[PDB]
Design a protein around this ligand. Structure first.
Ligand SMILES: CCc1cc(S(=O)(=O)NC(=O)Nc2ncc(Br)s2)ccc1-c1ccccc1
Ligand SMILES: CCc1cc(S(=O)(=O)NC(=O)Nc2ncc(Br)s2)ccc1-c1ccccc1
Ligand SMILES: CCc1cc(S(=O)(=O)NC(=O)Nc2ncc(Br)s2)ccc1-c1ccccc1
Ligand SMILES: CCc1cc(S(=O)(=O)NC(=O)Nc2ncc(Br)s2)ccc1-c1ccccc1
Lengths: 310, 310, 310, 312
């Protein structure tokens, strides 16, 4: 039957007899996503990551379901005024890949939603929860089409934006990543700076000792695109720690965690090398994390080589 | 001032006091792109590159400006019935990258336009001209926005589709690629099969001898996106012959030739390793060709290593 | 603040802590509205009031909020299957004015929503309520822009569809009709059959006795266009009882009743001449009704003239 | 085969071996229509009022076409003389958003245009816009209704195009339209019946109460000229905005409302009169002068003109 994101969220929200605050929040995000999608298709005529930031910021503020908002674009967390204050914490990158938008390759919005756990007054620390605590997370990918991928406790669902009616149509129910993929994704230009484990794992994808087929390589350089491909076709994506960047480069709160959550809810894995990404407890909201995610056999096989190098 | 694609082609067409057949052909092409763009932003829905083929076929056949049409989706060249017959030959990929559209990564339309050179009755042979003979070429990239790249004798111009009004807006007049880039683009999964020249060139990009910065890596795997990025940012793109596809992989008539034409007309280069791409005289409509294209300094620096290897 | 139909409808439902079934009904209705609009902007291109009925029919059936559906296009009431059964009855014209769409004049969707009366099997009898029992009613007007007019207990609100984002933006909060207008609206070609009371009232509008300005005449003949203009500019709309048609022409259940409800909730009036439209108790789901509605001073002035005529 | 406005106009322009200045002008016009159509469908989500943008939209699209020298608009008191670098050979009279005082009620709005070729070799001036309607090269209207329709009348005839919003192309949906010989619908404001010229009261009375006791006509009046005329074209009948004694010259403007509708009507086999003459034969003395107009099906306008004769 015909399913929309807005119908989907109402059915499950009625099922659980919750107050509606999350359903309101998600509609607020999803309405913001359509706006960003619309501006991104004419992005150039007559900044853009600032429109996207203010759009999400204000649609979230006025949903009455948020108390603390963390954005890549703001130095400190945003504390909602008391009259509009609600029960959830939101971390989001409003336009990831906006530095690589001239080449018109994919850009995206990534979000993670937490519950405020304490009853203290809202502060920056309410966003410093571990990824395990995520209530809902996912991304909008503004590509050949606009797709919203929503991961929650029940699982991962893919909605396609139909611009003719401005509704997110359910196109992939409860998606589950392949156990093992045939594709690897990372920037090999920085091979000069690779941790030796990364060097060895990549060589094994290009030169298998067991004389099976070598893997293919893809790297758009936009995290939303690279991860979505890992989700849909299977494989491995790596933005790992090198010796210059000992904690990786991507941000934990609003890039690594929501992708780690989506992966895990699809049956995949997501690590820093040392632990699961979702078990890292943040002390800084803009802190970084290495990330290797994808099919469990591939993330495990990478972990097998990571173990070898001390 | 405000310029549209339809206006631009007519102004250059009026300037040359030509018959109007090419202007009609280009509008029939550009109208086709707008339909394809619509289809791609609304994909999924429970095959699509066949829509794109038949759209382009019928838009061209009824332009009265075409006589022989070569498409990736058809085994033989298409010979237009005489009542609609015209003076131009069109080679085209109606949806390049349509096998990687589940990942919502770029899809695109590539086209090459020849005036029929022989005076026989039209046949497949009329499509076997070399790229040097191209009158017009370019691509539509269905990405975060739909962008049309039109290369002609005067130079390269980029038009962005405005979806509110369905017009291609001029956003880049007389584009010129960077003299040298910082990005190389290829599938390194075929590393086991690389010609030593590609192997050495790639080694120089990751580990420079001159103690400069290594290049970055990008590879979408959809040729329109990689070429468009190379044009917009500079760098070098390679799909060389590996040991599996010894005559290269990309098609000469509608991938290599139109992209080589755009490169060269923007001050760049495009080679097979042995020669320039556009100087190759084709014998088969779906024949393949190795290709290395992009910035002149980068294409040249690769060619230096090709010489070194006999 | 920025308000959309979906955000507004969730807040009113949260405030009153209802089960959510009406909000789902309104959203399924709204999605049908957007779908109809898109088709109405491309009509003629190769009936349509059948697409709209099937569109509303299945959007409502699968809302899980309805049990009985009465349409202008189906002879009997439609009983929703028990798996999809809900507590509300909806009477609607899915595409009002579908006979005059060649002139690109307005078309519309009219709906009225009731609460199920029986606890038996839902049946046609559940649709035979008087207008007073209406939970919600209103119309979508597909004109120069698409407008949704939603009337509830709190009042009447007007929403404008933004097609770039496919969200209904609130543009008119708690609208109230002018006390007295300067425009009258009915078909004067049928003057031959007028009840003498109608003849006298209309003549008073062309030739005022008190030496005031004569009223203007407007008549689109599509009920959604005329009533909305009556709502927004004030005046009176008449499709009265003549002796040839003693029960009027428009259908009571899904044209007169929702329009009367919107009028009354907006500070206006709506009569059969003999009584209020919402006070008529229907005996047939397709029964007819005379209707005179609009600004209260004008309807009263008509009613005082109807009284004079025996 | 499947035809768009842009394909159609190029084919006819190549058939006639012309220079292209007219085709470019029409494309600049079509681009103006699509933009206005998009803005009208969002006529609420708020910087300047809409008819002021529409005027500037059409003004600058025509100026920068290199095909115009004189432009007459409802919103500008004098003709606008195009600067020489962008100067071309055509004159455009247009209403960029007709019916815009009644856009709040979402009833139809429209864009009306008539295009004349500059006749003199003098410097372009306001006088160049004073040609009569017969001299029209091209005219028609955009109706922004439930869908956006482009109606284009030329010497060969009248064609109706549908704006398809997914691709921004005007799709030809009605080739060489022809109005009914006789209709069953009349159109004018009967609120002003107290002020009717005596022939009008008689002709309307004949339509509500026919003497031959045939069927009475139905009445329709939107109050937007584009919609009222367009319904007349498609269904047949008669539209009237005639002269009363209070308004001896009618109300509508000749150069950019009456003339282009008269051209569309006549090229579609219809009629269009002031009562005293055919609309396209009036020789204008002021670019903003008014003219009465009665248009539509050939049989209906004639039955009116016969009543007009009885009255001196
Ligand atoms: C759909 C998301 C969701 C939202 C909420 S809630 O707190 O937002 N409540 C809520 O929306 N109630 C409503 N009542 C009437 C209407 Br109409 S919506 C509670 C649970 C879940 C959920 C998540 C995953 C699986 C299953 C359920
Ligand atoms: C723009 C494409 C083009 C088309 C043609 S043509 O053969 O199609 N003639 C043509 O269109 N004539 C017209 N007359 C009135 C109108 Br309006 S269009 C001839 C030359 C060029 C051209 C190409 C590159 C650089 C400069 C010009
Ligand atoms: C907006 C229409 C409406 C719907 C409903 S309801 O039965 O649909 N319940 C409902 O929506 N609950 C939800 N809780 C959380 C979320 Br998120 S939705 C109850 C009352 C009213 C209402 C009507 C008129 C005035 C004021 C309110
Ligand atoms: C609006 C169509 C039209 C345009 C012109 S023109 O002066 O604009 N020439 C013109 O466009 N030439 C071109 N050359 C290359 C290309 Br591609 S178009 C002349 C006559 C007619 C015409 C009008 C009515 C019926 C039949 C034809």
């Amino acid at each position: 039957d015909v399913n929309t994101l807005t119908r989907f969220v109402m059915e499950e929200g009625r099922k659980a007899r919750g107050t509606g605050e999350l359903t309101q929040l998600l509609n607020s995000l999803c309405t913001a996503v359509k706006a960003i999608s619309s501006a991104v298709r004419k992005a150039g005529i007559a900044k853009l990551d600032v429109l996207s930031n203010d759009l999400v910021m204000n649609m979230l503020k006025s949903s009455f379901a948020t108390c603390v908002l963390v954005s890549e674009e703001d130095k400190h967390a945003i504390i909602v005024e008391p009259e509009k204050r609600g029960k959830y914490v939101v971390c989001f990158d409003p336009l990831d890949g906006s530095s690589n938008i001239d080449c018109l390759v994919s850009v995206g919005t990534i979000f993670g939603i937490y519950r405020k756990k304490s009853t203290d007054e809202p502060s920056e620390k309410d966003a410093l929860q571990p990824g395990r605590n995520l209530v809902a997370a996912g991304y909008a990918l503004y590509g050949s089409a606009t797709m919203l991928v929503l991961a929650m406790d029940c699982g991962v669902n893919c909605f396609m934006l139909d611009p003719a009616i401005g509704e997110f149509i359910l196109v992939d129910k409860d998606v589950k990543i392949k156990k093992k993929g045939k594709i690897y994704s990372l920037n090999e230009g920085y091979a000069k700076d690779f941790d030796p484990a990364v060097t060895e794992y990549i060589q094994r994808k290009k030169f298998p000792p067991d004389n099976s087929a070598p893997y293919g390589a893809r790297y758009v350089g936009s995290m939303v695109a690279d991860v979505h491909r890992t989700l849909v076709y299977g494989g491995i994506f790596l933005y790992p720690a090198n010796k210059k960047s000992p904690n990786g480069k991507l941000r934990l709160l609003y890039e690594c965690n929501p992708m780690a959550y989506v992966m895990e809810k699809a049956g995949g894995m997501a690590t820093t090398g040392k632990e699961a990404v979702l078990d890292v407890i943040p002390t800084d909201i803009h802190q970084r994390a290495p990330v290797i995610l994808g099919s469990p056999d591939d993330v495990l096989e990478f972990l097998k080589v990571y173990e070898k190098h001390s």
